[PDB]
Design a protein around this ligand. Structure first.
Ligand code: MG
Ligand code: MG
Ligand code: MG
Ligand code: MG
Ligand code: MG
Ligand code: MG
Ligand code: MG
Ligand code: MG
Ligand code: MG
Ligand code: MG
Ligand code: MG
Ligand code: MG
Ligand code: MG
Ligand code: MG
Ligand code: MG
Ligand code: MG
Ligand code: MG
Ligand code: MG
Ligand code: MG
Ligand code: MG
Ligand code: MG
Ligand code: MG
Ligand code: MG
Ligand code: MG
Ligand code: MG
Ligand code: MG
Ligand code: MG
Ligand code: MG
Ligand code: MG
Ligand code: MG
Ligand code: MG
Ligand code: MG
Ligand code: MG
Ligand code: MG
Ligand code: MG
Ligand code: MG
Ligand code: MG
Ligand code: MG
Ligand code: MG
Ligand code: MG
Ligand code: MG
Ligand code: MG
Ligand code: MG
Ligand code: MG
Ligand code: MG
Ligand code: MG
Ligand code: MG
Ligand code: MG
Ligand code: MG
Ligand code: MG
Ligand code: MG
Ligand code: MG
Ligand code: MG
Ligand code: MG
Ligand code: MG
Ligand code: MG
Ligand code: MG
Ligand code: MG
Ligand code: MG
Ligand code: MG
Ligand code: MG
Ligand code: MG
Ligand code: MG
Ligand code: MG
Ligand code: MG
Ligand code: MG
Ligand code: MG
Ligand code: MG
Ligand code: MG
Ligand code: MG
Ligand code: MG
Ligand code: MG
Ligand code: MG
Ligand code: MG
Ligand code: MG
Ligand code: MG
Ligand code: MG
Ligand code: MG
Ligand code: MG
Ligand code: MG
Ligand code: MG
Ligand code: MG
Ligand code: MG
Ligand code: MG
Ligand code: MG
Ligand code: MG
Ligand code: MG
Ligand code: MG
Ligand code: MG
Ligand code: MG
Ligand code: MG
Ligand code: MG
Ligand code: MG
Ligand code: MG
Ligand code: MG
Ligand code: MG
Ligand code: MG
Ligand code: MG
Ligand code: MG
Ligand code: MG
Ligand code: MG
Ligand code: MG
Ligand code: MG
Ligand code: MG
Ligand code: MG
Ligand code: MG
Ligand code: MG
Ligand code: MG
Ligand code: MG
Ligand code: MG
Ligand code: MG
Ligand code: MG
Ligand code: MG
Ligand code: MG
Ligand code: MG
Ligand code: MG
Ligand code: MG
Ligand code: MG
Ligand code: MG
Ligand code: MG
Ligand code: MG
Ligand code: MG
Ligand code: MG
Ligand code: MG
Ligand code: MG
Ligand code: MG
Ligand code: MG
Ligand code: MG
Ligand code: MG
Ligand code: MG
Ligand code: MG
Ligand code: MG
Ligand code: MG
Ligand code: MG
Ligand code: MG
Ligand code: MG
Ligand code: MG
Ligand code: MG
Ligand code: MG
Ligand code: MG
Ligand code: MG
Ligand code: MG
Ligand code: MG
Ligand code: MG
Ligand code: MG
Ligand code: MG
Ligand code: MG
Ligand code: MG
Ligand code: MG
Ligand code: MG
Ligand code: MG
Ligand code: MG
Ligand code: MG
Ligand code: MG
Ligand code: MG
Ligand code: MG
Ligand code: MG
Ligand code: MG
Ligand code: MG
Ligand code: MG
Ligand code: MG
Ligand code: MG
Ligand code: MG
Ligand code: MG
Ligand code: MG
Ligand code: MG
Ligand code: MG
Ligand code: MG
Ligand code: MG
Ligand code: MG
Ligand code: MG
Ligand code: MG
Ligand code: MG
Ligand code: MG
Ligand code: MG
Ligand code: MG
Ligand code: MG
Ligand code: MG
Ligand code: MG
Ligand code: MG
Ligand code: MG
Ligand code: MG
Ligand code: MG
Ligand code: MG
Ligand code: MG
Ligand code: MG
Ligand code: MG
Ligand code: MG
Ligand code: MG
Ligand code: MG
Ligand code: MG
Ligand code: MG
Ligand code: MG
Ligand code: MG
Ligand code: MG
Ligand code: MG
Ligand code: MG
Ligand code: MG
Ligand code: MG
Ligand code: MG
Ligand code: MG
Ligand code: MG
Ligand code: MG
Ligand code: MG
Ligand code: MG
Ligand code: MG
Ligand code: MG
Ligand code: MG
Ligand code: MG
Ligand code: MG
Ligand code: MG
Ligand code: MG
Ligand code: MG
Ligand code: MG
Ligand code: MG
Ligand code: MG
Ligand code: MG
Ligand code: MG
Ligand code: MG
Ligand code: MG
Ligand code: MG
Ligand code: MG
Ligand code: MG
Ligand code: MG
Ligand code: MG
Ligand code: MG
Ligand code: MG
Ligand code: MG
Ligand code: MG
Ligand code: MG
Ligand code: MG
Ligand code: MG
Ligand code: MG
Ligand code: MG
Ligand code: MG
Ligand code: MG
Ligand code: MG
Ligand code: MG
Ligand code: MG
Ligand code: MG
Ligand code: MG
Ligand code: MG
Ligand code: MG
Ligand code: MG
Ligand code: MG
Ligand code: MG
Ligand code: MG
Ligand code: MG
Ligand code: MG
Ligand code: MG
Ligand code: MG
Ligand code: MG
Ligand code: MG
Ligand code: MG
Ligand code: MG
Ligand code: MG
Ligand code: MG
Ligand code: MG
Ligand code: MG
Ligand code: MG
Ligand code: MG
Ligand code: MG
Ligand code: MG
Ligand code: MG
Ligand code: MG
Ligand code: MG
Ligand code: MG
Lengths: 92, 271, 45
RNA sequence: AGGACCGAACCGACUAAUGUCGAAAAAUUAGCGGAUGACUUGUGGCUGGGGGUGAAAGGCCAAUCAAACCGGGAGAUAGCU
RNA sequence: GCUCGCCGGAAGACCAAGGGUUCCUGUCCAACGUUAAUCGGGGCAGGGUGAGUCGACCCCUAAGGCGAGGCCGAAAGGCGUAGUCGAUGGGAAACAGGUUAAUAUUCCUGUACUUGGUGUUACUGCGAAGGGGGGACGGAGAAGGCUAUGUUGGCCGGGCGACGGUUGUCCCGGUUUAAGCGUGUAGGCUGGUUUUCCAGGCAAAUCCGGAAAAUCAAGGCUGAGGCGUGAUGACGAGGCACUACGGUGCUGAAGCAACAAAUGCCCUGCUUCCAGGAAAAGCCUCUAAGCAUCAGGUAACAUCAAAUCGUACCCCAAACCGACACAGGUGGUCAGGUAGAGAAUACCAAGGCGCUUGAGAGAACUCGGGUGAAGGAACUAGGCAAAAUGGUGCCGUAACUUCGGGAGAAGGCACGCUGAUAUGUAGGUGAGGCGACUUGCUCGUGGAGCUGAAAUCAGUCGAAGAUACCAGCUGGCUGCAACUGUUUAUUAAAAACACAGCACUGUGCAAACACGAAAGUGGACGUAUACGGUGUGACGCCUGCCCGGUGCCGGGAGGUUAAU
């Protein structure tokens, strides 16, 4: 079910307070995904790579901040994060 | 009846309404209705071709039957209705077979009366016949200029054509203008006079009445500046030029008929 | 107090957008010009 | 019933004062007119420059109008400063 | 932190548009901030936007746009047909509570619902580029039934007075709960069926339309609400608990009744009027081309699914439009108390703010206000400006009139508070009862409580009782314009424009005329009781003479007369 490509979806685990509070209490994992990456493709990726029972994936697109570097203005890249809820069989 | 309105307000004072009691108080027959969106007097190019039109009340088109294609089928008049896109009233005719159509209501007509149309039929108001079969010296309306077509002449309230003479294939008609026109005898004509003759006795009474009829204000040439209209300028109410349209063609007695094709059919021009 | 610029992104793009310029021969020459001059913002988009 | 009456919202702009390098390239304060209609307003269309639109003032058409704006002819032309 | 002040139909709370990180935390004050700044919408890091149900995308269309062929046009290209786009409109479904420093109808808990695929199964005619139905519609008005919401009792927990009183008719606080599902009411709307038959709805139809009937009188449809579940729940005023004086984490009582009441909802309804009030899909239904154990429908237990994008924050503003942290502009939604007719106004609640230079002094003069002896328009171009009048009820109200008006003419009088009539009245209002009528959200008594004007009479205080805010100045003669309306955005609002009405005139429909090299469009899906142009400008009384001149119209002999 969409082999090879699934590996390119998940970029990194997200580190934050909101990310931490949703580990123990809500039983989810926040993580940075590819700008494409549908909820099915994230779920299916977590199901094989991380190998845990996924309840549901909620997804959102974060907009890049407009920073500075003296004169030349620059905008950061629009990355996409995925709150992935897990089932009772959880770990990481 | 033609009821004058009481002067409870300036603007009401001069109002004179044409209150027809027989008309239907209710929504019309939907299958014959369709949309009729307004132009505002502008065309393809989006420009005012005809001035002084715009706004007014929204109004739906009733598909009125000018052709009268049903031959030898009787038809009962179900109810008379108000038509907002027309001077005359209309009658919801129910054909014996099942069909319903709107027609222009003639004078002597009510909810219940029977109408037949075709070749034979009877000589009576409302019945549509070819002008060959119709007796000479008789009042008709909704007259076709071309056989098989709709019905062009005398469709306005109280309007009627009189058949003067009958020269073989042609029929000489005296029209409401005073013009005597020669049409083909095969063309049809609905017998009698078009109803709602009181229409012209209506007097609106206020500016707003014309506005909600879709008319906009006419500004006199003389009021304008010379750049705008041939009558124009002057320091305080001048004129001193011959009356003319905004495009300089003379009005006020200046023949603009120039068809040439149809001049053969016109027996005698109006006066 | 009711100024000339009353912004609307739909109107903006319908009036001055890339496709609105692409629709017409005169509009394609505008783009041709901005490209020739070498602009970054070829149209408002 | 009403282009009816009084009167808030809303739309307007009659008078006065202030302001006039303003708080504001047209406003404020106190009064003022319309306020179910020819009303008002949101959103989206259409009309293009001798052209539009104009209940007509030469009004309005992006703070520009007896002929918009931008580029070009173009270093127009100037018996004038 | 405690006072004080201000807004409160906003200066509060949600949005759309538009912005585009301005949101939150930590840190830093060079510049930015009209002053200082430890603070900041500033700098710099990091964090923050979680959807089958909200919106967008998606199915459908209006105005309009584009437009295969096509018609038209020196070229460019214009118009437009089948189509395809285009919301500001139509079309499936989720709520209450809890939660973050920053999101929540999206996370969480408890309850729900909606459309699909693929099954399973019993049962069966399905099937359109097609027909019919529905969607599906205006203004105004009126009335009833409701609800949001409030108020007052009861009830429950606390209180016993910083200064005389206060164990009470006393004081403070609370009295909350949704979609869903069940119920089908106040009420709206409609004669049901059953059979046959028929030149109609381009074909076909059992559907729609029409025509016979026969036959019981109702059967459907729509619908607020309320009640019952939802809800041994949720929540709940204080307590306790701990203190990192941030709060963390435990419980948690009553949790009712009457009255009042919308501009909300039934009502897309009803009555009425004319100026006569989108479209198209979803939806329901009928059959053609077909298909006939079939595929297809129908139902029911499943099951799998419901992708993508927006979601922070401002949003009458220091974040949008105005060059500014600008005394301007900016669409929708929510609408608490007391007084009041009220969304006016005053004072307040929720909630939010004190407008990013202050401190003194208390000259002239300027600005915005208050008061003023005697006089009272003598000012001045002009009562400009100020002052004054102002509410409700009742009495009264002239010429003139188009018979409506004028008219709120004018001008008067009464208004507070307290008892009484009446331990709160007519009125509204409805309970425990009791007929009964059946199965009800019943009819009709019945009138316990709450609610409550307006009066009259008698007292009574003040200088003044519509005591504040709020809230006409009035009359006479007269020019112009009938009137409401429109107008020089930014020195002119008028007698100017428009106007209903009036006349002349053109126009016989491939209409005149207008836009357009043209095709073609408007006029008009109109047809002389119509349409265009011109002037005049309600209404009443009228509108006189001149056709030499200029135009226009008609006439065709004669003169002159181009191209050929
Ligand atoms: Mg769920
Ligand atoms: Mg979820
Ligand atoms: Mg999302
Ligand atoms: Mg964002
Ligand atoms: Mg980038
Ligand atoms: Mg980065
Ligand atoms: Mg890059
Ligand atoms: Mg109706
Ligand atoms: Mg048309
Ligand atoms: Mg065009
Ligand atoms: Mg076009
Ligand atoms: Mg156009
Ligand atoms: Mg015209
Ligand atoms: Mg006209
Ligand atoms: Mg019409
Ligand atoms: Mg006129
Ligand atoms: Mg006029
Ligand atoms: Mg004219
Ligand atoms: Mg004038
Ligand atoms: Mg003028
Ligand atoms: Mg001229
Ligand atoms: Mg003049
Ligand atoms: Mg003169
Ligand atoms: Mg003269
Ligand atoms: Mg001339
Ligand atoms: Mg012309
Ligand atoms: Mg001329
Ligand atoms: Mg700009
Ligand atoms: Mg806009
Ligand atoms: Mg535009
Ligand atoms: Mg009025
Ligand atoms: Mg106000
Ligand atoms: Mg206002
Ligand atoms: Mg506004
Ligand atoms: Mg305004
Ligand atoms: Mg003024
Ligand atoms: Mg103004
Ligand atoms: Mg006033
Ligand atoms: Mg006002
Ligand atoms: Mg008035
Ligand atoms: Mg008023
Ligand atoms: Mg009024
Ligand atoms: Mg009215
Ligand atoms: Mg617009
Ligand atoms: Mg234009
Ligand atoms: Mg011209
Ligand atoms: Mg031109
Ligand atoms: Mg002038
Ligand atoms: Mg020019
Ligand atoms: Mg010029
Ligand atoms: Mg220029
Ligand atoms: Mg030069
Ligand atoms: Mg040259
Ligand atoms: Mg206050
Ligand atoms: Mg309020
Ligand atoms: Mg806020
Ligand atoms: Mg919020
Ligand atoms: Mg929201
Ligand atoms: Mg939002
Ligand atoms: Mg900006
Ligand atoms: Mg936004
Ligand atoms: Mg920044
Ligand atoms: Mg700190
Ligand atoms: Mg700090
Ligand atoms: Mg410092
Ligand atoms: Mg430094
Ligand atoms: Mg430093
Ligand atoms: Mg600074
Ligand atoms: Mg500073
Ligand atoms: Mg602060
Ligand atoms: Mg900070
Ligand atoms: Mg902040
Ligand atoms: Mg910050
Ligand atoms: Mg900052
Ligand atoms: Mg820096
Ligand atoms: Mg750091
Ligand atoms: Mg870093
Ligand atoms: Mg959801
Ligand atoms: Mg969605
Ligand atoms: Mg959910
Ligand atoms: Mg939401
Ligand atoms: Mg939705
Ligand atoms: Mg999408
Ligand atoms: Mg093409
Ligand atoms: Mg092809
Ligand atoms: Mg082509
Ligand atoms: Mg042709
Ligand atoms: Mg071509
Ligand atoms: Mg074209
Ligand atoms: Mg075009
Ligand atoms: Mg086209
Ligand atoms: Mg095809
Ligand atoms: Mg089309
Ligand atoms: Mg399509
Ligand atoms: Mg479409
Ligand atoms: Mg929409
Ligand atoms: Mg919308
Ligand atoms: Mg919609
Ligand atoms: Mg829907
Ligand atoms: Mg929608
Ligand atoms: Mg819904
Ligand atoms: Mg909903
Ligand atoms: Mg927030
Ligand atoms: Mg909720
Ligand atoms: Mg969950
Ligand atoms: Mg469920
Ligand atoms: Mg379901
Ligand atoms: Mg299946
Ligand atoms: Mg199935
Ligand atoms: Mg089987
Ligand atoms: Mg069938
Ligand atoms: Mg079928
Ligand atoms: Mg179908
Ligand atoms: Mg509608
Ligand atoms: Mg209506
Ligand atoms: Mg309306
Ligand atoms: Mg009315
Ligand atoms: Mg009315
Ligand atoms: Mg009542
Ligand atoms: Mg009653
Ligand atoms: Mg009742
Ligand atoms: Mg209630
Ligand atoms: Mg209320
Ligand atoms: Mg109240
Ligand atoms: Mg009390
Ligand atoms: Mg006690
Ligand atoms: Mg004491
Ligand atoms: Mg005591
Ligand atoms: Mg209380
Ligand atoms: Mg309370
Ligand atoms: Mg309850
Ligand atoms: Mg619901
Ligand atoms: Mg259900
Ligand atoms: Mg039921
Ligand atoms: Mg029932
Ligand atoms: Mg029902
Ligand atoms: Mg049922
Ligand atoms: Mg009944
Ligand atoms: Mg048939
Ligand atoms: Mg055909
Ligand atoms: Mg049958
Ligand atoms: Mg039938
Ligand atoms: Mg209910
Ligand atoms: Mg119910
Ligand atoms: Mg309810
Ligand atoms: Mg309960
Ligand atoms: Mg219990
Ligand atoms: Mg609790
Ligand atoms: Mg608590
Ligand atoms: Mg409990
Ligand atoms: Mg309990
Ligand atoms: Mg009540
Ligand atoms: Mg009530
Ligand atoms: Mg009501
Ligand atoms: Mg209202
Ligand atoms: Mg409301
Ligand atoms: Mg309604
Ligand atoms: Mg089978
Ligand atoms: Mg099957
Ligand atoms: Mg299940
Ligand atoms: Mg299921
Ligand atoms: Mg499943
Ligand atoms: Mg899907
Ligand atoms: Mg928000
Ligand atoms: Mg706000
Ligand atoms: Mg505000
Ligand atoms: Mg608002
Ligand atoms: Mg605000
Ligand atoms: Mg700004
Ligand atoms: Mg500017
Ligand atoms: Mg600017
Ligand atoms: Mg400031
Ligand atoms: Mg401001
Ligand atoms: Mg300010
Ligand atoms: Mg304003
Ligand atoms: Mg809006
Ligand atoms: Mg509302
Ligand atoms: Mg209030
Ligand atoms: Mg009150
Ligand atoms: Mg107020
Ligand atoms: Mg206060
Ligand atoms: Mg407060
Ligand atoms: Mg408070
Ligand atoms: Mg605020
Ligand atoms: Mg504060
Ligand atoms: Mg302060
Ligand atoms: Mg400050
Ligand atoms: Mg100071
Ligand atoms: Mg001193
Ligand atoms: Mg002083
Ligand atoms: Mg001194
Ligand atoms: Mg001084
Ligand atoms: Mg000064
Ligand atoms: Mg002073
Ligand atoms: Mg002053
Ligand atoms: Mg005073
Ligand atoms: Mg003073
Ligand atoms: Mg004074
Ligand atoms: Mg004095
Ligand atoms: Mg004194
Ligand atoms: Mg005195
Ligand atoms: Mg005196
Ligand atoms: Mg005097
Ligand atoms: Mg004197
Ligand atoms: Mg004097
Ligand atoms: Mg003097
Ligand atoms: Mg004088
Ligand atoms: Mg004067
Ligand atoms: Mg004055
Ligand atoms: Mg005084
Ligand atoms: Mg005063
Ligand atoms: Mg005073
Ligand atoms: Mg007073
Ligand atoms: Mg009085
Ligand atoms: Mg009164
Ligand atoms: Mg009188
Ligand atoms: Mg007199
Ligand atoms: Mg009278
Ligand atoms: Mg008088
Ligand atoms: Mg009277
Ligand atoms: Mg009086
Ligand atoms: Mg009086
Ligand atoms: Mg008078
Ligand atoms: Mg009082
Ligand atoms: Mg008493
Ligand atoms: Mg009582
Ligand atoms: Mg009583
Ligand atoms: Mg009752
Ligand atoms: Mg009982
Ligand atoms: Mg009693
Ligand atoms: Mg009784
Ligand atoms: Mg009582
Ligand atoms: Mg007394
Ligand atoms: Mg007394
Ligand atoms: Mg006292
Ligand atoms: Mg006394
Ligand atoms: Mg008194
Ligand atoms: Mg007073
Ligand atoms: Mg008054
Ligand atoms: Mg006189
Ligand atoms: Mg004089
Ligand atoms: Mg005189
Ligand atoms: Mg006069
Ligand atoms: Mg006038
Ligand atoms: Mg006159
Ligand atoms: Mg005006
Ligand atoms: Mg205007
Ligand atoms: Mg104006
Ligand atoms: Mg001006
Ligand atoms: Mg000017
Ligand atoms: Mg004026
Ligand atoms: Mg002025
Ligand atoms: Mg007039
Ligand atoms: Mg006449
Ligand atoms: Mg051309
Ligand atoms: Mg032609
Ligand atoms: Mg045509
Ligand atoms: Mg049409
Ligand atoms: Mg005529
Ligand atoms: Mg005039
Ligand atoms: Mg005149
Ligand atoms: Mg007259
Ligand atoms: Mg006369
Ligand atoms: Mg002569
Ligand atoms: Mg002639
Ligand atoms: Mg002639
Ligand atoms: Mg001649």
């Amino acid at each position: 079910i969409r082999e090879e490509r699934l590996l390119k979806v998940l970029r990194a685990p997200h580190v934050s307070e909101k990310a931490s509070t949703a580990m123990e209490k809500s039983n989810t994992i926040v993580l940075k995904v590819a700008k494409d990456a549908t909820k099915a493709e994230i779920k299916a990726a977590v199901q094989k790579l991380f190998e845990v029972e996924v309840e549901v994936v909620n997804t959102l697109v974060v907009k890049g901040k407009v920073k500075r570097h003296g004169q030349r203005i620059g905008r950061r890249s629009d990355w996409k994060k995925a709150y992935v809820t897990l089932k009772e069989g959880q770990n990481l | 009846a033609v009821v004058k309105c009481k002067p409870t307000s300036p603007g009401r004072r001069h109002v004179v309404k044409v209150v027809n009691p027989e008309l239907h108080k209710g929504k019309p027959f939907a299958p014959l209705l369709e949309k009729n969106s307004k132009s505002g007097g502008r065309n393809n190019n989006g420009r005012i071709t005809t001035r002084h039109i715009g706004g007014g009340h929204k109004q739906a088109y009733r598909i009125v039957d000018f052709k009268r294609n049903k031959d030898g089928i009787p038809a009962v008049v179900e109810r008379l209705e108000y038509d907002p896109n027309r001077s005359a009233n209309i009658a919801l005719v129910l054909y014996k077979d099942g069909e319903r159509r709107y027609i222009l209501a003639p004078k002597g007509l009510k909810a219940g009366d029977q109408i037949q149309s075709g070749v034979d039929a009877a000589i009576k108001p409302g019945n549509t016949l070819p002008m060959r079969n119709i007796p000479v010296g008789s009042t008709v309306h909704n007259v076709e200029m071309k056989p098989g077509k709709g019905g062009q002449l005398a469709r306005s309230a109280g309007t009627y054509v009189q058949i003067v003479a009958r020269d073989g294939a042609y029929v000489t008609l005296r029209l409401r203008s005073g013009e005597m026109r020669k049409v083909e005898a095969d063309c049809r004509a609905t017998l009698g006079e078009v109803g709602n003759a009181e229409h012209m006795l209506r007097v609106l009474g206020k500016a707003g009445a014309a506005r909600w009829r879709g008319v906009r204000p006419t500004v006199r040439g003389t009021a304008m500046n010379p750049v705008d209209h041939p009558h124009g300028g002057g320091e305080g109410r001048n004129f001193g030029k011959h009356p003319v349209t905004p495009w300089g063609v003379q009005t006020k007695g200046k023949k603009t008929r120039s068809n040439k094709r149809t001049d053969k059919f016109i027996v005698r021009r109006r006066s | 107090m009711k100024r000339t610029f009353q912004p609307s992104v739909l109107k903006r793009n319908r009036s001055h957008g890339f496709r609105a310029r692409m629709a017409t021969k005169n509009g394609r020459q505008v783009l041709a010009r901005r490209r020739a001059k070498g602009r970054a913002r070829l149209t408002v988009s």
